[PDB]
Enzyme design. Structure first.
Site, PDB file in Angstrom:
ATOM      1  N   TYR A 119       5.225   7.701  16.167  1.00  0.00           N
ATOM      2  CA  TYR A 119       4.366   8.154  17.259  1.00  0.00           C
ATOM      3  C   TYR A 119       3.765   9.531  16.978  1.00  0.00           C
ATOM      4  CZ  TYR A 119       6.092   4.448  20.346  1.00  0.00           C
ATOM      5  OH  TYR A 119       6.427   3.256  20.919  1.00  0.00           O
ATOM      6  N   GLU A 173       8.342  -1.737  21.866  1.00  0.00           N
ATOM      7  CA  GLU A 173       9.123  -1.105  22.939  1.00  0.00           C
ATOM      8  C   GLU A 173       9.494  -2.080  24.064  1.00  0.00           C
ATOM      9  OE1 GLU A 173      10.389   1.553  22.228  1.00  0.00           O
ATOM     10  OE2 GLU A 173       9.008   2.935  21.227  1.00  0.00           O
ATOM     11  N   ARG A 176      12.410  -3.969  22.929  1.00  0.00           N
ATOM     12  CA  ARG A 176      13.632  -3.170  22.920  1.00  0.00           C
ATOM     13  C   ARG A 176      14.195  -2.943  24.317  1.00  0.00           C
ATOM     14  NH1 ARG A 176      10.256   0.752  19.241  1.00  0.00           N
ATOM     15  NH2 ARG A 176      10.833   0.054  17.130  1.00  0.00           N
TER      16      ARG A 176
HETATM   17  N1  LIG Z   1       4.675   1.748  13.701  1.00  0.00           N
HETATM   18  C1  LIG Z   1       5.679   1.940  14.602  1.00  0.00           C
HETATM   19  N2  LIG Z   1       6.351   0.867  15.125  1.00  0.00           N
HETATM   20  C2  LIG Z   1       7.352   1.019  16.020  1.00  0.00           C
HETATM   21  O1  LIG Z   1       7.975   0.050  16.511  1.00  0.00           O
HETATM   22  C3  LIG Z   1       7.694   2.397  16.422  1.00  0.00           C
HETATM   23  N3  LIG Z   1       8.668   2.660  17.306  1.00  0.00           N
HETATM   24  C4  LIG Z   1       8.923   3.929  17.618  1.00  0.00           C
HETATM   25  C5  LIG Z   1       8.204   4.979  17.048  1.00  0.00           C
HETATM   26  C6  LIG Z   1       8.560   6.383  17.407  1.00  0.00           C
HETATM   27  O2  LIG Z   1       7.970   7.294  16.857  1.00  0.00           O
HETATM   28  N4  LIG Z   1       9.564   6.611  18.249  1.00  0.00           N
HETATM   29  C7  LIG Z   1       9.823   7.973  18.670  1.00  0.00           C
HETATM   30  C8  LIG Z   1      11.284   8.319  18.584  1.00  0.00           C
HETATM   31  O3  LIG Z   1      11.678   9.377  19.035  1.00  0.00           O
HETATM   32  N5  LIG Z   1      12.085   7.424  18.011  1.00  0.00           N
HETATM   33  C9  LIG Z   1      13.532   7.584  18.005  1.00  0.00           C
HETATM   34  C10 LIG Z   1      14.224   6.260  18.341  1.00  0.00           C
HETATM   35  C11 LIG Z   1      13.731   5.193  17.386  1.00  0.00           C
HETATM   36  C12 LIG Z   1      12.584   4.468  17.684  1.00  0.00           C
HETATM   37  C13 LIG Z   1      12.141   3.490  16.798  1.00  0.00           C
HETATM   38  C14 LIG Z   1      12.830   3.239  15.619  1.00  0.00           C
HETATM   39  C15 LIG Z   1      13.979   3.964  15.321  1.00  0.00           C
HETATM   40  C16 LIG Z   1      14.424   4.938  16.203  1.00  0.00           C
HETATM   41  C17 LIG Z   1      14.008   8.114  16.680  1.00  0.00           C
HETATM   42  O4  LIG Z   1      15.198   8.274  16.461  1.00  0.00           O
HETATM   43  N6  LIG Z   1      13.059   8.387  15.786  1.00  0.00           N
HETATM   44  C18 LIG Z   1      13.344   8.993  14.500  1.00  0.00           C
HETATM   45  C19 LIG Z   1      12.149   8.769  13.580  1.00  0.00           C
HETATM   46  C20 LIG Z   1      12.002   7.293  13.274  1.00  0.00           C
HETATM   47  C21 LIG Z   1      12.892   6.667  12.404  1.00  0.00           C
HETATM   48  C22 LIG Z   1      12.756   5.310  12.120  1.00  0.00           C
HETATM   49  C23 LIG Z   1      11.727   4.575  12.703  1.00  0.00           C
HETATM   50  C24 LIG Z   1      10.839   5.199  13.574  1.00  0.00           C
HETATM   51  C25 LIG Z   1      10.971   6.557  13.859  1.00  0.00           C
HETATM   52  C26 LIG Z   1      13.616  10.468  14.618  1.00  0.00           C
HETATM   53  O5  LIG Z   1      13.135  11.160  15.651  1.00  0.00           O
HETATM   54  O6  LIG Z   1      14.273  11.052  13.768  1.00  0.00           O
HETATM   55  N7  LIG Z   1       7.216   4.757  16.159  1.00  0.00           N
HETATM   56  C27 LIG Z   1       6.924   3.495  15.811  1.00  0.00           C
HETATM   57  N8  LIG Z   1       5.959   3.206  14.943  1.00  0.00           N
END
Ligand SMILES: Nc1nc(=O)c2ncc(C(=O)NCC(=O)N[C@@H](Cc3ccccc3)C(=O)N[C@@H](Cc3ccccc3)C(=O)O)nc2[nH]1
Length: 263
Positions: A119, A173, A176
């Site tokens: 994001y 989302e 999820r």
């Molecule tokens: N292309 C895409 N597809 C998705 O389903 C998606 N889903 C989510 C996000 C995204 O930024 N999420 C923001 C966030 O804060 N994510 C958390 C929770 C999460 C969400 C989705 C997947 C895994 C974890 C996180 O720990 N994010 C990580 C970064 C991360 C890691 C792996 C996959 C996506 C984001 C961090 O802040 O350290 N981006 C996406 N991009």
């Protein structure tokens, strides 16, 4: 050979959307891992490549179609196909780079973006944050056309990134979180687009942390409470998996389930 789930924004209703989201979840989870009644996605460790992805075929009223690829380990959208071109976000690692070679294998134009798909990156490219990007059937309809026209210069990168942001929230989302699915149902039922409120944003941002807190919990009890936000931005403390059963539909695999020490 990867599973394909179809959805069209054309004439979409709460029921057709519901059917879609339920089918996606069915293809993401195997039934092998359920904790406190909440399904866990497959562990990336030892997952055969032939089971790694699912495909989501999106069509709209404009008679256009695009295919999203979702990674089953996290429901993450890793790229998409539109006709003769496929586009993938920048992989986090070598293993992922290899894995995506198994997608859309006969597409004649393969591109990997120089940017990743999170994001933060997408919001920068879009020139807008999630809280300012409307979601609903109209935005998804428009998102599908935008993705479709990218390869021919019709779609600006800002509008592409914005369109990804719409797709990810309405598909990944929603899969999820029952809560987010419900938010999308509402928008579809009344055909009224609106940006996500803080309850939606905080859930999205916390998915990993909630997943870990539940899986590491003591019989469901969090060692450390997690703060979320309600619709009005006010704080809501989560102390236990119990309140999340109607809210979270799937977790990312974070740890092994402890031996179930029974009384
Ligand atoms: N292309 C895409 N597809 C998705 O389903 C998606 N889903 C989510 C996000 C995204 O930024 N999420 C923001 C966030 O804060 N994510 C958390 C929770 C999460 C969400 C989705 C997947 C895994 C974890 C996180 O720990 N994010 C990580 C970064 C991360 C890691 C792996 C996959 C996506 C984001 C961090 O802040 O350290 N981006 C996406 N991009």
């Amino acid at each position: 050979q990867y599973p394909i789930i179809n959805f069209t924004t054309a004439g979409a209703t709460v029921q057709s959307y519901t059917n879609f989201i339920r089918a996606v979840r069915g293809r993401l989870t195997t039934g092998a891992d359920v904790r406190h009644e909440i399904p866990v996605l497959p562990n990336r460790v030892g997952l055969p490549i032939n089971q790694r992805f699912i495909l989501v075929e999106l069509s709209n009223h404009a008679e256009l179609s695009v295919t999203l690829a979702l990674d089953v380990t996290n429901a993450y959208v890793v790229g998409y196909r539109a006709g003769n071109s496929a586009y993938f976000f920048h992989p986090d690692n070598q293993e992922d780079a290899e894995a995506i070679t198994h997608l859309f294998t006969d597409v004649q134009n393969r591109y990997t973006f120089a940017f990743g798909g999170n994001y933060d990156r997408l919001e920068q490219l879009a020139g807008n944050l999630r809280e300012n990007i409307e979601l609903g059937n109209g935005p998804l309809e428009e998102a599908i056309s935008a993705l479709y026209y990218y390869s021919t210069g019709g779609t600006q990168l800002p509008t592409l990134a914005r369109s990804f942001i719409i797709c990810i929230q309405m598909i990944s989302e929603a899969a999820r979180f029952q809560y987010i699915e419900g938010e999308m149902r509402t928008r579809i039922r009344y055909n009224r687009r609106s940006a996500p409120d803080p309850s939606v944003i905080t859930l999205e941002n916390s998915w990993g942390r909630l997943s870990t807190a539940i899986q590491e919990s003591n019989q469901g009890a969090f060692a450390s409470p997690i703060q979320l936000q309600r619709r009005n931005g006010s704080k809501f403390s989560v102390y236990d998996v119990s309140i999340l059963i109607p809210i979270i539909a799937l977790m990312v695999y974070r740890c092994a389930p402890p031996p179930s020490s029974q009384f």
